[PDB]
RNA sequence: CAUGGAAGUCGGAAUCCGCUAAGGACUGUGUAACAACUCACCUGCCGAAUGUACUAGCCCUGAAAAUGGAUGGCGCUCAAGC
């Protein structure tokens, strides 16, 4: 609980120093992804996140220095963190969005769009054919590499990805999902 | 009780499996030999009933009547598209004018007749099998007459095309 | 230690009607009628508001208070069942021997009876008789799917179980021989 | 790499636990080429790790790699 | 040959179960006490031997 | 270190820090070794009291013998039992 007690002092000190704060809607952002984006903004700006701070921060509202803090209490809803930056709005406005990962299927994820596999030459050895056998895709061997004959619709959109399908997708370096950091509404923007 | 579409899939996949071993152990010294059904290197049949067939036997038989170029029609199966549109001319992909699904040439031409003998013989429609027998002008069964049901099938298939001729060819 | 008052409530949508008399519940809506007999339970029914049913027990023990929440969900199922029906699905699973099913509607006895043939390549023919009010269907969207539907959840589920329990393997490994008819999802007809 | 004679073979078959090495401030040269790979907040903060990773040799004299970290008084940009 | 998902469903009803060490009864996958009476509702349970 | 090979998960000995909202030189499944899955830990939703370890009353399991059978018998359940 060392950080738990510290959180009040750490939050109050940092918030006052930074004139403007960005609240960011972090949904399904991997720890590695969060670590790397920190490096881009590591030089300028500070990022802090914790469990919902509505009640604890409200105590600061009572004391006279800032009554506007109450205004943002309703805005924070769920799974959204906020970031402190001393820079101007325009340069940091859209700069943080840069970087997007391409997460492989997790054998249970729901595809937003239909996933289509085009015909072509994989270039992989003949031994890997067994994986293709389960999905039933027609295959032919050309120049000692597996060649897909005709395109086959892997899965209908909105259905959970089968465990067999997920393993195949990562090998071919094709995935529907793309994930990136998301900005929630900031200071009435 | 395999359906025609399912049966076609099994033949394809097994040929692919055999192809993988031939490809992996092929000697590079001479000959890029691989098994392809379109090349007439695969035949189908049942040893116990002594009936076997290859694509050419059906192709030439259909070539004689309602057939223009047998050799061009050789690569008319195993992929690409199969045609049954209102317009005679064939097209690529199974999409039709109204969106109805299209036939599969291997099942529609080769595999439709074979099913017909099995169900009729098992259901004891001797009159029907005789009627179908004369539709393609099949030859008479000689000695085998009285015994019907699971005995005709070997006899009718042997008369329709004996395995030995296909093997030698 | 006996609790002095235990109370539960039940909301009723304004699409049906319900009448209670000597612990004989009758629910009637746009899909039929259902009855139950709760004479084995000592509960007091009453009307709290214009659209809320109430039931209570006084000076009950621990073993006796447990039964209030049971009664609530039983009556709730009747209300939801009459206005939304129920629908179970079942799937075939086999390795070598295909399973064949026949569904013929009995005439003058109303109820349906199923027929299972060729189970694990078996020569016997086994027959099961459904309960009145349940309707059996063979799916047309997916392959090898059975669909059971009806009005009373207890009958629907019990009829499905009969089909599942009739198809068993004997004197084998049930870890390897995975043949049989099984249930795959439970839900309602509407929505 | 920066150690005492190299045991080519046959003498190294048994244990070979000769970990009694010594370091003072040379290790920082080995620090530099690591190019601050992953969010270490400059050399001063990250110094704690490399010493503690080399806990096998127990530094030298009365020093212990863990002992260095808590008494954080050394130059940070050096 | 069984389709993957099928294996999962059929195994749920046949394979993932606990077993009493006193009366060999077949128990749910999250039980803590046997439900029979000749064993005394014992609470020494073990998983069903998975088939490799 | 160890050795055919042991990348957290055959074994021996150590048991540190960075970034945090959080992550163990690790709890299992798994590979010849990798990979892959999961747990510990933290977070999103909800709206109020729970969680663990012990003690002794009645009841239950532990509790298998030979002609038909004995709280004296019939019978007794907010007892006609303690
Ligand atoms: Zn037990």
TrEMBL record, chain A:
Transmembrane segments: none annotated. It comes from the Eukaryota. The keyword Phosphoprotein applies. Keywords: Phosphoprotein, Ribonucleoprotein, Ribosomal protein. GO terms for molecular function: large ribosomal subunit rRNA binding; structural constituent of ribosome. GO terms for biological process: cytoplasmic translation; ribosomal large subunit assembly. One of its GO terms (cellular component) is cytosolic large ribosomal subunit. Belongs to the universal ribosomal protein uL10 family. Component of the ribosome, a large ribonucleoprotein complex responsible for the synthesis of proteins in the cell. The small ribosomal subunit (SSU) binds messenger RNAs (mRNAs) and translates the encoded message by selecting cognate aminoacyl-transfer RNA (tRNA) molecules. The large subunit (LSU) contains the ribosomal catalytic site termed the peptidyl transferase center (PTC), which catalyzes the formation of peptide bonds, thereby polymerizing the amino acids delivered by tRNAs into a polypeptide chain. This is 60S acidic ribosomal protein P0. It comes from Chaetomium thermophilum (strain DSM 1495 / CBS 144.50 / IMI 039719) (Thermochaetoides thermophila). The chain holds residues 5 to 193 of 312 of the full protein.
From TrEMBL, chain B:
It is found in: Cytoplasm. One of its GO terms (molecular function) is GTPase activity. It comes from the Eukaryota. The keyword GTP-binding applies. GO terms for cellular component: cytosol; ribonucleoprotein complex. GDP binds at residues 47-48. Coiled coil: none annotated. Keywords: Cytoplasm, Elongation factor, GTP-binding, Hydrolase, Nucleotide-binding, Protein biosynthesis. The keyword Plastid does not apply. Catalyzes the GTP-dependent ribosomal translocation step during translation elongation. During this step, the ribosome changes from the pre-translocational (PRE) to the post-translocational (POST) state as the newly formed A-site-bound peptidyl-tRNA and P-site-bound deacylated tRNA move to the P and E sites, respectively. Catalyzes the coordinated movement of the two tRNA molecules, the mRNA and conformational changes in the ribosome. This is Elongation factor 2. It comes from Chaetomium thermophilum (strain DSM 1495 / CBS 144.50 / IMI 039719). The lineage of its organism: Eukaryota, Fungi, Dikarya, Ascomycota, Pezizomycotina. The chain holds residues 170 to 338 of 845 of the full protein.
Automatic annotation (TrEMBL), chain C:
It comes from the Eukaryota. InterPro entries: Ribosomal_uL6-like, Ribosomal_uL6-like_a/b-dom_sf, Ribosomal_uL6_a/b-dom, Ribosomal_uL6_CS2. Belongs to the universal ribosomal protein uL6 family. PROSITE patterns: RIBOSOMAL_L6_2. This is 60S ribosomal protein l9-like protein. GO terms for cellular component: cytosolic large ribosomal subunit. Residues 16-85, 97-180 form the Large ribosomal subunit protein uL6 alpha-beta domain. Pfam families: Ribosomal_L6.
From TrEMBL, chain D:
It comes from Chaetomium thermophilum (strain DSM 1495 / CBS 144.50 / IMI 039719). It comes from the Eukaryota. Belongs to the universal ribosomal protein uL11 family. GO terms for biological process: cytoplasmic translation; ribosomal large subunit assembly. This is 60S ribosomal protein L12-like protein. Coiled coil: none annotated. GO terms for cellular component: cytosolic large ribosomal subunit. Signal peptide: none annotated. The keyword Ribonucleoprotein applies. Component of the ribosome, a large ribonucleoprotein complex responsible for the synthesis of proteins in the cell. The small ribosomal subunit (SSU) binds messenger RNAs (mRNAs) and translates the encoded message by selecting cognate aminoacyl-transfer RNA (tRNA) molecules. The large subunit (LSU) contains the ribosomal catalytic site termed the peptidyl transferase center (PTC), which catalyzes the formation of peptide bonds, thereby polymerizing the amino acids delivered by tRNAs into a polypeptide chain. Residues 1-60 form the Large ribosomal subunit protein uL11 C-terminal domain. The chain holds residues 84 to 161 of 165 of the full protein. Keywords: Ribonucleoprotein, Ribosomal protein. One of its GO terms (molecular function) is structural constituent of ribosome.
């Amino acid at each position: 609980s060392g950080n738990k007690a510290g959180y009040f002092d750490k939050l109050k000190g940092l918030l006052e120093e930074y004139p403007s704060i960005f609240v960011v809607s972090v949904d399904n952002v991997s720890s590695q992804q969060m670590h790397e984006i920190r490096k881009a903004l590591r030089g300028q700006g500070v990022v802090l996140m914790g469990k919902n701070t509505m009640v604890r921060r409200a105590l600061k509202t009572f004391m006279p220095d800032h009554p506007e803090y109450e205004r943002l209490l309703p805005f924070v809803k769920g799974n959204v963190g906020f970031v402190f930056t001393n820079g101007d709005l325009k340069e940091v406005r859209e700069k943080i969005l840069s970087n997007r990962i391409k997460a492989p299927a997790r054998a249970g994820a729901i595809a937003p769009v239909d996933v289509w596999v085009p015909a072509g030459n994989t270039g992989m050895e003949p031994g890997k054919t067994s994986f293709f056998q389960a999905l039933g895709i027609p295959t032919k061997i050309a120049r000692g590499t597996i060649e897909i004959t005709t395109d086959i619709k892997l899965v209908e959109a909105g259905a959970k990805v089968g465990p067999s399908e997920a393993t195949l997708l990562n090998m071919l370096n094709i995935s529907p999902f793309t994930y990136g950091m998301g900005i929630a509404q900031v200071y009435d923007q | 009780q395999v359906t025609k579409e399912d049966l076609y899939q099994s033949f394809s996949r097994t040929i692919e499996s055999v192809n993988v071993i031939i490809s992996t152990y092929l000697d590079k010294a001479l000959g890029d030999v691989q098994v392809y059904p379109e090349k007439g290197t695969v035949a189908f049949g049942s040893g116990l009933h002594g009936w076997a067939f290859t694509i050419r036997q059906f192709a030439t038989r259909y070539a004689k009547k309602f057939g223009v170029d047998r050799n061009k029609m050789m690569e008319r199966l195993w992929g690409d598209n199969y045609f049954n549109p209102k317009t005679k001319k064939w097209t690529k992909s199974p999409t039709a004018a109204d969106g109805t699904q299209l036939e599969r040439a291997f099942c529609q031409f080769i595999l439709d007749p074979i099913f017909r003998i099995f169900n009729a013989v098992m259901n004891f429609k001797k009159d029907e099998v005789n009627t179908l027998l004369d539709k393609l002008n099949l030859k008479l069964p000689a000695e085998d007459r009285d015994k019907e049901g699971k005995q005709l099938l070997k006899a009718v298939m042997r008369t329709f095309l004996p395995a030995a001729d296909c093997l030698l060819e | 230690m006996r609790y002095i008052h235990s109370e539960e409530t039940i909301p009723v949508p304004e699409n049906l009607k319900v009448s209670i008399k000597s612990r004989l519940v009758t629910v009637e809506g746009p899909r039929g009628k259902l009855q139950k007999d709760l004479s084995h339970i000592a509960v007091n029914f009453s009307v709290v508001k214009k659209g809320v049913i109430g039931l209570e027990i006084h000076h009950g023990s621990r073993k006796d208070v447990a039964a209030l929440r049971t009664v609530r969900t039983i009556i709730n199922n009747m209300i939801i069942g009459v206005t939304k029906g129920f629908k179970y699905k079942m799937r075939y699973v086999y390795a070598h021997f295909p399973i064949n099913v026949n569904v013929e509607k009995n005439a003058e006895t109303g109820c349906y009876e199923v027929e299972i043939r060729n189970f694990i390549g078996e020569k016997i023919v086994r027959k099961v008789v459904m309960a009145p009010g349940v309707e059996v269907e063979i799916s047309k969207a997916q392959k090898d799917e059975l669909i059971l539907s009806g009005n009373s959840l207890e009958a629907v589920s019990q009829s499905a179980a009969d089909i599942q329990q009739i198809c068993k393997v004997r004197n084998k490994d049930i870890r390897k021989f995975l043949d049989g008819i099984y249930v795959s999802e439970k839900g309602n007809i509407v929505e | 790499a920066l150690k005492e004679p190299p045991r080519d073979r046959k003498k190294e078959k048994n244990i070979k636990h000769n970990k009694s090495v010594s370091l003072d401030e040379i290790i920082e040269i080995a620090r530099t080429m690591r190019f601050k790979s992953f969010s270490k907040d400059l050399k001063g903060g990250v110094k704690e790790i490399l010493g503690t990773a080399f806990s096998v040799g127990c530094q030298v004299d009365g020093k212990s790699p863990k002992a260095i970290s808590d008494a954080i008084e050394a130059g940070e940009i050096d | 040959i069984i389709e993957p998902s099928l294996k999962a469903l059929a195994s749920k009803f046949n394979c993932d179960k606990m077993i009493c060490r006193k009366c060999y009864a077949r128990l749910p996958p999250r039980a803590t006490n046997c439900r029979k009476r000749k064993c005394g509702h014992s609470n020494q349970l073990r998983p069903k031997k998975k088939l490799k």
